[PDB]
Design a protein around this ligand. Structure first.
Ligand SMILES: CC(=O)N[C@H]1C(=O)O[C@H](CO)[C@@H](O)[C@@H]1O
Ligand SMILES: CC(=O)N[C@H]1C(=O)O[C@H](CO)[C@@H](O)[C@@H]1O
Ligand SMILES: CC(=O)N[C@H]1C(=O)O[C@H](CO)[C@@H](O)[C@@H]1O
Ligand SMILES: CC(=O)N[C@H]1C(=O)O[C@H](CO)[C@@H](O)[C@@H]1O
Ligand SMILES: CC(=O)N[C@H]1C(=O)O[C@H](CO)[C@@H](O)[C@@H]1O
Ligand SMILES: CC(=O)N[C@H]1C(=O)O[C@H](CO)[C@@H](O)[C@@H]1O
Ligand SMILES: CC(=O)N[C@H]1C(=O)O[C@H](CO)[C@@H](O)[C@@H]1O
Ligand SMILES: CC(=O)N[C@H]1C(=O)O[C@H](CO)[C@@H](O)[C@@H]1O
Ligand SMILES: CC(=O)N[C@H]1C(=O)O[C@H](CO)[C@@H](O)[C@@H]1O
Lengths: 85, 88, 93, 93, 91, 88, 85, 93, 94, 92
């Protein structure tokens, strides 16, 4: 989470930036601030894991602009589509 | 403008209470007290609503605003309180 | 509480913001507004004295009040609902 | 010779980063002291880059072995045994 | 497993590289014993990449901490504490 | 060189996004999404920005280049596009 | 305003001559040409008007290296600072 | 004395001009057929001045009654009832 | 406001001033003038009691009103168009 | 834009990316800042003019250090260092 308690239903619009700034129209005026009572984000906890086991053993791992995933392990060199899930 | 635009559904689109995107481009819709999620339709033969996945089974009609923070967190105004969490 | 949030926020606009049919962002941070059946685009105001509505370009000619939903996909596509019809394209220009 | 004809775009501190790479739009991304930073590349030695970067990650960014962009704008990351992907974050909140 | 179900495109020498990366058009760039090579990526183990690569960089290549392409084709680099950009070299 | 030089301001001067002259010698400055205009300052006691005239009110911080043609027109590059007009 | 469409931000430098030629650095090369989509200049439309009646009535009107404005109007001779606005 | 000891710095076409005067730097200014021309004075009969002059003004220069320089390098002009000043133009643009 | 400007200027001359075919300064501020076929030079006047034409040296005897243009370069050289021809030289001197 | 360049005159052909500043004084002299040095010389008129070779070094060190460096129409050089603003005739 409860992040505010009074008047929240009173805005005419209430919506975010692409950078997460909260915007609000109230009483014909317009406001910008970060939302009330935010938490630290932690991206990894919300990300899709797509592989599990040995991923840090690659000496390089990087994409071609065509979207294939290139990789070096030991002496060898691999391309496939990225893994998915 | 509607001239050059793909039509991507026909019935029902006006009976949604909210209708909007998460940062990933999945589509969200509230109807009949429920919250639905599926990727947007690309044309009229996609019974979007028939495939959507009911991520919220009741309670979703009370909302004054229902929308996404760009980090993926879902925000909600009910009555006069303001709420946030990851989507269910 | 909303009033003290509003207390510590920045007042970046001061009149004429109630009257828009729609007010939302594309993914590149431009602000769109529908008013008097028209569509408008421009940088958000950074302060009280920015006459945002004078400043803004009319990308959209008429009809715009007639959309039930009008909102942006993250890939920059404009999605709109009219009557019971769902549509999609790049934004007007 | 490349170095002699190169434009110098920053005069100190570049050594501190553990990753430094572009997304497909050419925003420059950086990990420093376990934090994640984003902004348009700098352009002269007086472009203080770190002081105008957005700190979009507050902690844990130094545990990754790889951190890099798919052309589709998704960020991929390897931590320990695991491989992950997600849109990059936009705020540390 | 991913490795299993993937194409092998190279078979030896691949860790001799200090840098190994793409430009926006898909040429493979590589640093190795202080030099910079460039050629279109390999396709199978039968392909001898370093034998068909152009040396485009003569010396000093391994002094960089970072070395990577901007989508617009400008090549960026950190050496020591300083930062640089410019069109890649070309032979 | 800063040996022989006149110091004509002491704060905020870095922090302008652009900083330049028209052909007549007025100084122009972009900061906080605004365009300011006033004759240059001749000393520290001159609060340039407090006197500058805000000849543009919002929209100014988008620009990759902002500069005068020597006949008095103001050229500007926003994103991909290139512009000119007499100054506001 | 519009005078240019794709690419205008590619350049490293983009600035004028004293004579109005536009210079440009792109991809490590320097170009000079007239800017695109120029208009005829018309100086009188942009000049500062400093006076408003009977100015053409003078037989002579000309400056001393002083900056004093000298003027003859039928048989009499005058000097003063030029007018201002 | 004067005509006999004078240097001849040009030999036809001088009659066409409606104004002809110096700016404080000593560049030569001329109006002819409603156009404004500017270049360093010529120096001999073979110095074809008008073929190397920049056409800095391309119309309405004939409607002026006076056109002259302040020592500070501003161009003053009288046209009809009105009086004006500005830096001289530098191109017909 | 041509009258407005005049009203507020020093009146520095009273009559005769309209007989001048040319009337201009050199780089140092000497005033030159042509009437009849003659060139006069002196320091400019500063009130109507100053009889300028009476203190000016005649520095040019005849031919002065044959010019279309007669004017000083900043470096002190004197330029003239006569007919279709153009000339420069140090001004004459008496 | 690509075709603006196509009809422009190419008057320089390598090494122009590296400057920190590249601007004109009111008399038409070109100034460039490179490797912490200020250079001055009339602009090339063609590809084969090795501009950086002929240019006179007129400022010996410090030149990369200004955030702005630019000319007033009356010929004065204005510069910004850190939080501070300056002006003087250019060096020589
Ligand atoms: C809201 C919704 O899901 N609408 C779709 C639906 O019901 O099936 C139709 C075809 O059967 C589509 O054209 C509709 O747009
Ligand atoms: C709707 C809109 O753009 N409103 C702006 C406006 O009209 O000018 C006021 C002062 O200029 C600003 O405070 C307003 O926010
Ligand atoms: C790491 C980073 O952003 N460094 C910039 C910085 O600290 O300011 C300096 C000058 O002010 C720049 O030259 C540095 O490159
Ligand atoms: C380093 C390596 O090849 N790891 C494989 C593995 O065994 O675990 C995952 C199963 O989800 C796969 O995605 C990986 O390819
Ligand atoms: C680094 C490099 O160029 N490696 C290739 C090479 O030496 O030729 C072999 C085929 O003979 C391949 O196994 C290698 O991938
Ligand atoms: C950018 C600007 O206008 N700066 C001036 C300012 O804020 O007032 C000071 C005196 O109080 C001056 O010395 C500053 O240079
Ligand atoms: C060859 C030559 O002298 N031509 C005449 C001419 O062409 O006009 C120039 C400018 O009017 C003058 O200097 C010359 O008088
Ligand atoms: C051309 C000339 O010299 N005019 C003066 C003159 O003739 O004597 C008058 C009485 O002294 C003056 O007032 C005149 O300005
Ligand atoms: C900065 C500079 O002067 N570059 C010039 C240079 O180095 O010589 C080349 C041929 O000599 C020219 O094409 C370049 O423009």
């Amino acid at each position: 989470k409860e992040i505010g308690n009074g008047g929240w239903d009173q805005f005419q619009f209430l919506f975010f930036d692409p950078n997460g700034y909260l915007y609000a129209v109230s009483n014909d005026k317009l406001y910008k601030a970060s939302p009330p009572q935010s938490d630290t984000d932690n991206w990894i906890a919300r990300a899709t894991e797509i592989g599990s086991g040995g991923w840090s053993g690659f000496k390089f791992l990087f994409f071609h602009p065509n979207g294939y995933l290139y990789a070096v392990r030991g002496q060898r060199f691999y391309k496939a589509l990225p893994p998915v899930s």
